[PDB]
Amino acid sequence: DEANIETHGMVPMNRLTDDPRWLPAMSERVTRMVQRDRNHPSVIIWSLGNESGHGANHDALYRWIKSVDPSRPVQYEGGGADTTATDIICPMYARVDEDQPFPAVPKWSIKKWLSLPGETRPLILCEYAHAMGNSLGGFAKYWQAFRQYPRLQGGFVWDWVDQSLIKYDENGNPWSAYGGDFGDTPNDRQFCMNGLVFADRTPH
Amino acid sequence: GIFRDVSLLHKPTTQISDFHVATRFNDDFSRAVLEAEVQMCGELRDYLRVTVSLWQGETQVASGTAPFGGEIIDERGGYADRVTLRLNVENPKLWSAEIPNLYRAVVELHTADGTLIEAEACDVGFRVVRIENGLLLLNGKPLLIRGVNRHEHHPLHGQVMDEQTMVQDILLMKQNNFNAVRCSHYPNHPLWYTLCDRYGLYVVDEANIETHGMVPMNRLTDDPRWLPAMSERVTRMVQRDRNHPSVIIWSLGNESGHGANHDALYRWIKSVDPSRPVQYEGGGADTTATDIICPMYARVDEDQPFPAVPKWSIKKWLSLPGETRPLILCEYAHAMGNSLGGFAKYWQAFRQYPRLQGGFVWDWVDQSLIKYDENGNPWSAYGGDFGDTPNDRQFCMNGLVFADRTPH
Numbered sequence: 001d002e003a004n005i006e007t008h009g010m011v012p013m014n015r016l017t018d019d020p021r022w023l024p025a026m027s028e029r030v031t032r033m034v035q036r037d038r039n040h041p042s043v044i045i046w047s048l049g050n051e052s053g054h055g056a057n058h059d060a061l062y063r064w065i066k067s068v069d070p071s072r073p074v075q076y077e078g079g080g081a082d083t084t085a086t087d088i089i090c091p092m093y094a095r096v097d098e099d100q101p102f103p104a105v106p107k108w109s110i111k112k113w114l115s116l117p118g119e120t121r122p123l124i125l126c127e128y129a130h131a132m133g134n135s136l137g138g139f140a141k142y143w144q145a146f147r148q149y150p151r152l153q154g155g156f157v158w159d160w161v162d163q164s165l166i167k168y169d170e171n172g173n174p175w176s177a178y179g180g181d182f183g184d185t186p187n188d189r190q191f192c193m194n195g196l197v198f199a200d201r202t203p204h
Numbered sequence: 205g206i207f208r209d210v211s212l213l214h215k216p217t218t219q220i221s222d223f224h225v226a227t228r229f230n231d232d233f234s235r236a237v238l239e240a241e242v243q244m245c246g247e248l249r250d251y252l253r254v255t256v257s258l259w260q261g262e263t264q265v266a267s268g269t270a271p272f273g274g275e276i277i278d279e280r281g282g283y284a285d286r287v288t289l290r291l292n293v294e295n296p297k298l299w300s301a302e303i304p305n306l307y308r309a310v311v312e313l314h315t316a317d318g319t320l321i322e323a324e325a326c327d328v329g330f331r332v333v334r335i336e337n338g339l340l341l342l343n344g345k346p347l348l349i350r351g352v353n354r355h356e357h358h359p360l361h362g363q364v365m366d367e368q369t370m371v372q373d374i375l376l377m378k379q380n381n382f383n384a385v386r387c388s389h390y391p392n393h394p395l396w397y398t399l400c401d402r403y404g405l406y407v408v409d410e411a412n413i414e415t416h417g418m419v420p421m422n423r424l425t426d427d428p429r430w431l432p433a434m435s436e437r438v439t440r441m442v443q444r445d446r447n448h449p450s451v452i453i454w455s456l457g458n459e460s461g462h463g464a465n466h467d468a469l470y471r472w473i474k475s476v477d478p479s480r481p482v483q484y485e486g487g488g489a490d491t492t493a494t495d496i497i498c499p500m501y502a503r504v505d506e507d508q509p510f511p512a513v514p515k516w517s518i519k520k521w522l523s524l525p526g527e528t529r530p531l532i533l534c535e536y537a538h539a540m541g542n543s544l545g546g547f548a549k550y551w552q553a554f555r556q557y558p559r560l561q562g563g564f565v566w567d568w569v570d571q572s573l574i575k576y577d578e579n580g581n582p583w584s585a586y587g588g589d590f591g592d593t594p595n596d597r598q599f600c601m602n603g604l605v606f607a608d609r610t611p612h
């Protein structure tokens with residue numbers, strides 16, 4: 001269960017989440033989620049949101065959750081996927097064997113990530129195996145790793161269903177549309193369609 | 205046989221009986237303290253003095269003089285027959301396999317009025333070896349062990365070692381980008397360590413304990429009746445070799461399972477010499493008797509799940525729940541004949557993974573022996589060629605170089 005906090009477009013990504021003036025707003029999105037959903041057994045992990053960097057507000061709200069509901073781990077990928085605001089190493093699109101050494105937020109090989117000095121947490125990818133169109137090449141490598149490594153406990157494929165929308169031709173025929181087909185500009189054309197199933201839930 | 209040197213040593217009645225050198229550093233290795241503990245035997249007298257002088261070539265960099273009598277250590281007092289000199293060295297030249305900077309420590313037992321009774325001496329290398337946050341550090345930097353296992357073997361003289369062969373080996377090793385050697389599986393000829401101090405090789409000094417043939421392998425090492433014997437092999441090694449800077453790691457032996465005697469002697473080493481990590485591969489390579497995960501022939505990516513002593517993939521091994529130690533293979537890349545296939549995979553892993561800090565190839569030199577044909581021609585022989593039976597025919601030849609030190 002994930003709080004409705006994403007500030008991906010900020011520069012830097014944590015401009016708001018490191019700002020105490022936005023701590024109230026963020027808090028409401030976390031606290032009110034927990035207060036609503038904490039009795040559901042299906043919810044096994046709390047998430048502080050997505051792609052909002054790593055700021056002190058995350059640390060604060062992490063600790064708040066841990067204090068009010070210690071029955072569930074808290075995870076958060078922002079700020080390098082292994083910050084103090086997560087109980088689980090939860091990277092996005094970390095590869096099995098290939099390192100991606102980005103400045104300040106590297107995406108290590110998940111195998112390597114587990115063994116970094118001082119690292120003891122489990123590793124569950126919050127996003128992997130980007131199913132954009134004709135994709136999921138190399139999925140078996142992930143699952144071989146998951147089964148071989150105890151602390152590689154899986155991940156969440158990105159993603160379930162294409163976010164396409166239905167438009168209608170001049171002849172009334174429906175067709176599937178993506179970014180830019182509604183005059184929306186700027187837009188990220190077909191990156192809305194990353195699903196294992198079509199929007200009508202027909203499988204890829 | 206008597207396969208190492210035999211000597212006579214004449215000492216005075218009042219003599220230096222033991223001396224240990226330790227080096228302590230500040231956070232950036234700009235300041236060092238050489239702590240020299242000197243012990244005497246014979247008649248104590250208030251005019252006796254110990255002077256410890258430290259030299260860089262012909263330059264005296266530090267010195268210290270003191271009468272005997274150490275500090276109070278328990279309710280009965282201190283050691284009247286010991287003294288610890290603490291010498292300060294500013295901006296010491298640090299010892300490493302890359303730059304084997306050495307000082308000369310001279311320990312003079314003399315009188316107050318200046319008469320020299322005797323003098324002992326050692327080469328001193330200023331370096332710190334410690335495991336920090338899962339990494340083996342030398343002088344604050346993580347090591348990458350380009351190591352090889354080396355038996356003391358000569359095709360003509362067997363297990364008799366000479367200086368010339370040692371030097372030949374060290375030169376070849378350094379010329380082939382080795383920086384470390386494992387004394388497989390026993391303390392080496394003394395000179396070895398000196399040469400490694402001088403030329404710059406990291407040394408794993410290994411107690412002469414291997415019980416591989418026992419069933420189970422720890423039948424003796426788990427038996428307290430064999431704890432004395434084992435102890436002598438460990439303790440007397442440390443007491444002999446603890447002043448050599450080249451020795452960076454102690455090993456409790458090889459292929460003797462995991463028994464309580466190992467735990468005891470591990471702790472003994474850690475108590476007497478906390479300046480060096482202790483490793484031991486037996487009992488699964490990750491037991492309580494080792495500071496370093498030191499498997500034999502663990503593969504890079506392939507698991508070998510043996511009962512009770514699995515050989516995990518080294519990458520996987522690092523990440524097992526609760527595991528934080530560095531991983532240095534005590535033996536890998538078995539160079540038996542036409543071999544070393546897949547070596548690059550090991551080195552890719554070593555460079556990618558911080559806590560994979562290398563290993564020791566098995567091994568340096570083929571253990572072949574020279575026999576002679578009917579026509580007087582020499583040929584290289586292996587197990588079974590001397591009527592020895594049972595024998596392990598050619599498994600004695602696992603070297604990167606031939607017995608004559610010609611490279612494979």
Ligand code: NA
Pocket residue numbers: 145146147148149150151152153154
């Ligand atoms: Na797993």
Ligand code: NA
Pocket residue numbers: 191192193194
């Ligand atoms: Na998308």
Ligand code: NA
Pocket residue numbers: 348553554555556557558559560561562
């Ligand atoms: Na490494």
Ligand code: NA
Pocket residue numbers: 599600601602
């Ligand atoms: Na062999």
